[PDB]
Design an enzyme around this catalytic site. Structure first.
Site, PDB file in Angstrom:
ATOM      1  CE  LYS A 164       0.064  -0.110   4.883  1.00  0.00           C
ATOM      2  NZ  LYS A 164      -0.618  -0.423   6.422  1.00  0.00           N
ATOM      3  CE1 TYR A 221      14.014  31.207   1.913  1.00  0.00           C
ATOM      4  CE2 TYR A 221      14.129  28.602   1.856  1.00  0.00           C
ATOM      5  CZ  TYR A 221      14.072  29.862   1.293  1.00  0.00           C
ATOM      6  OH  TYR A 221      13.523  29.989  -0.337  1.00  0.00           O
TER       7      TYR A 221
HETATM    8  C1  LIG Z   1      -0.101  -1.795   6.520  1.00  0.00           C
HETATM    9  C2  LIG Z   1      -0.753  -2.980   7.351  1.00  0.00           C
HETATM   10  C3  LIG Z   1       0.483  -3.890   7.593  1.00  0.00           C
HETATM   11  C4  LIG Z   1       1.905  -3.836   7.397  1.00  0.00           C
HETATM   12  O1  LIG Z   1       2.565  -3.238   8.361  1.00  0.00           O
HETATM   13  P1  LIG Z   1       3.822  -3.253   8.736  1.00  0.00           P
HETATM   14  O2  LIG Z   1       4.302  -2.498  10.194  1.00  0.00           O
HETATM   15  O3  LIG Z   1       4.572  -2.291   7.933  1.00  0.00           O
HETATM   16  O4  LIG Z   1       4.545  -4.472   8.875  1.00  0.00           O
HETATM   17  C5  LIG Z   1      -0.225  -5.394   7.804  1.00  0.00           C
HETATM   18  N1  LIG Z   1      -1.646  -5.480   7.952  1.00  0.00           N
HETATM   19  C6  LIG Z   1      -2.514  -4.294   8.347  1.00  0.00           C
HETATM   20  C7  LIG Z   1      -3.853  -4.364   8.637  1.00  0.00           C
HETATM   21  C8  LIG Z   1      -2.013  -2.894   7.829  1.00  0.00           C
HETATM   22  O5  LIG Z   1      -2.936  -1.774   7.798  1.00  0.00           O
HETATM   23  C1  LIG Z   2      10.777  28.827  -4.459  1.00  0.00           C
HETATM   24  C2  LIG Z   2      11.523  30.299  -4.696  1.00  0.00           C
HETATM   25  C3  LIG Z   2      10.740  31.213  -4.674  1.00  0.00           C
HETATM   26  C4  LIG Z   2       9.124  31.496  -4.220  1.00  0.00           C
HETATM   27  O1  LIG Z   2       9.215  31.589  -2.647  1.00  0.00           O
HETATM   28  P1  LIG Z   2       7.969  31.596  -1.821  1.00  0.00           P
HETATM   29  O2  LIG Z   2       8.468  32.283  -0.296  1.00  0.00           O
HETATM   30  O3  LIG Z   2       7.245  30.642  -1.847  1.00  0.00           O
HETATM   31  O4  LIG Z   2       7.002  33.057  -2.562  1.00  0.00           O
HETATM   32  C5  LIG Z   2      11.274  32.547  -5.395  1.00  0.00           C
HETATM   33  N1  LIG Z   2      12.429  32.536  -5.881  1.00  0.00           N
HETATM   34  C6  LIG Z   2      13.286  31.490  -5.699  1.00  0.00           C
HETATM   35  C7  LIG Z   2      14.793  31.779  -5.947  1.00  0.00           C
HETATM   36  C8  LIG Z   2      12.690  30.299  -5.120  1.00  0.00           C
HETATM   37  O5  LIG Z   2      13.830  29.269  -5.048  1.00  0.00           O
END
Ligand SMILES: *Cc1c(COP(=O)(O)O)cnc(C)c1O
Ligand SMILES: *Cc1c(COP(=O)(O)O)cnc(C)c1O
EC number: 5.1.1.1
Lengths: 359, 359
Positions: free
Chosen positions: A34, A255
């Site tokens: 999944k 940032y």
């Molecule tokens: C997704 C899930 C699993 C597998 O889980 P893991 O922790 O990755 O082993 C098995 N059975 C159900 C009911 C689940 O939803």
């Molecule tokens: C992603 C990015 C933006 C946009 O920034 P915001 O804070 O999401 O508006 C503008 N310029 C550069 C260089 C970026 O890498």
């Protein structure tokens, strides 16, 4: 590609299915794929395991996507079906389903299908998420054995809520409830996933459902890895440097000016960010491999880039290979450093990340 | 039934581009659509804004995906190109590029292209991420004006590291450095993204680069939403309930038994988890709308499901509409509650989530 890429080792995948058959020798295998096979690729992961007894998915859409790709093994709808109008497809596609509520049962009772469907009654033994509660289970169960649309016998499934915590009696209690309900009933039993398989051999029963450990990653937060159980890591989150720049003492990076250097050094910029699925929560110091050598992340992880501290005369250069996790760096190490679950790390990646398959 | 779905309001998208033209009236617009347009869809977001002066992307891959979809507008490679062998494509596709290192410049210098390329020299004014440092910028800049492969004039770009923190003098300092270098040079100037656009009118210059606010989400962490600036939210993360179960006092819910109920109640299960992109870090109590009514998340968010507390006689039922964020519930309110950046929330979603476009 040289930027955001997930490399999937098909050989390690097969090794793990076989290794799990060695750990649960008397149980069939429900390969859980999944959520795009935990970030490894739904269809490719299924095609790599033609030996799996069955495949488990969360939703109907995932199962149909498997049939569309040519996957023919039985597919288990772990949460059942969400609409009664789906029974005809499910019957025709030979999908096995869980049944946890009145709607699903009533649907089976009055549907008209060309073929009956294999069912696994989901019993709530403690998780309190999905499933029929103990006091309602006997009546619910009996109605399923009276359905003409249900292939007899009715199988019984359940799931553990705290199997990774062997010291609390949660698992023994669910097992106690599971065992009491199954007494005298035919039909396959299944309650164990990764944790139950590795830590509780008395929960293996007829079918075990390996998920995370199938990909060579430990389901425990005790800093153990898939290799602790003989399972090999399947995924490698890789990228490349897009810049190597000079930096000076006292100067901040990224940032919010989150990190300030105490020395003149050289910074590397990785073509990887949370727009790819890498955790924005990753703190400075988190390990990354640059040219197979570990360097720390410095500054806040951006949407498309990550800065690392290489050193004043580091001779790494733009274009050089970077490993976010994989070969010389288990995703479990990154989960401990970032405090993000390995389950989420490998699964919550975006469609921006390229997919490679080796072996 | 409906499961994990992102509904994109094309009308709100349009409104925001126009609203931003009102806030930065003397500047052209570089609609930033990197990382699958911040989770809204790279190509669809571009097609919704044929009015944008240009589009900004992180990587060359994204720009080429735009041309493949029929986007014809100038596309700005914000991080430049990672391989010299890409220049011919960049030139032919009419992609504008940033130039921040020696490799890129030396590539421009000895390439042989049928057409010159429009360039934006990236200057590091304080972020210390990408860009030429001040003391290397004048020589680097002069080499670009001597390139036959660069269409004159050379434009100048830079980016703010802390524009969302008006009280520290970070932005004024970057602006001071930016202004000193641009003195006497022709060519467009650009340094402002969402924050600079909204809080620093001195930084608008010739081109502004709206990213997050273009989608109606605030770039600040000051409990401001996009509506604080007249921008409308574009994304709605939605799903449906797949179960409504009885629950009793003293009983825990989900993995790790994270939440225990103090009363008999009814729990709803949502077809949404981190396998879709919903934060696994979401604490119990985080708000979610069920049938347009706010209910709290109870227990740990799983890969495919989320449980909510509906109430003992809550009349919600499997199949009913759920809103993780959107109309009625801004993503900023989920960011505050979960402590996850709104930037990451809307962007780090998986390919499992369906995409709808309205208006
Ligand atoms: C997704 C899930 C699993 C597998 O889980 P893991 O922790 O990755 O082993 C098995 N059975 C159900 C009911 C689940 O939803
Ligand atoms: C992603 C990015 C933006 C946009 O920034 P915001 O804070 O999401 O508006 C503008 N310029 C550069 C260089 C970026 O890498």
């Amino acid at each position: 590609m040289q930027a955001a890429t997930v490399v999937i080792n098909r050989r390690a995948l097969r090794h793990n299915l076989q290794r799990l058959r060695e750990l649960a020798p008397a149980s069939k295998m429900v390969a859980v794929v999944k959520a795009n096979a935990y970030g490894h690729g739904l269809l490719e992961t299924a095609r790599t395991l033609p030996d799996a007894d069955a495949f488990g998915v969360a939703r109907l859409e995932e199962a149909l996507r498997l049939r569309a790709g040519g996957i023919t093994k039985p597919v288990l709808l772990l949460e059942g079906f969400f609409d009664a109008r789906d029974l005809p497809t499910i019957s025709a596609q030979h999908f096995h389903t869980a049944v946890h509520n009145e709607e699903q049962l009533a649907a089976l009772e009055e549907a008209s299908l060309d073929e009956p469907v294999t069912v696994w009654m989901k019993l709530d033994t403690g998780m309190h998420r999905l499933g029929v509660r103990p006091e309602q289970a006997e009546a619910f169960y009996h109605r399923l054995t009276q359905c003409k649309n249900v292939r007899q016998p009715v199988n019984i499934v359940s799931h553990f809520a705290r199997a990774d915590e062997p010291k609390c009696g949660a698992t023994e209690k669910q097992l106690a409830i599971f065992n009491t309900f199954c007494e005298g009933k035919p039909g396959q039993r299944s309650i164990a996933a990764s944790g139950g398989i590795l830590l509780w051999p008395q929960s293996h029963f007829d079918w075990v459902r390996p998920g995370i450990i199938l990909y060579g990653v430990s389901p425990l937060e005790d800093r153990s890895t898939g290799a602790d159980f003989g399972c090999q890591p399947v995924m490698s989150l890789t990228s490349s440097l897009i810049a190597v720049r000079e930096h000076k003492a006292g100067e901040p990076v990224g940032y919010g000016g989150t990190w300030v250097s105490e020395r003149d050094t050289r910074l590397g910029v990785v073509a990887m960010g949370y727009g790819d699925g890498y955790p924005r929560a990753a703190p400075s110091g988190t390990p990354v491999l640059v040219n197979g050598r570990e360097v720390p992340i410095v500054g806040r992880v951006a949407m498309d880039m990550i800065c690392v501290d290489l050193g004043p005369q580091a001779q790494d250069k733009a274009g050089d290979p970077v490993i976010l996790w994989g070969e010389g760096l288990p995703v479990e190490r990154i989960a401990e450093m970032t405090k993000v679950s390995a389950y989420e790390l490998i699964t919550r990646l975006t469609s921006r990340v390229a997919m490679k398959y080796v072996d």
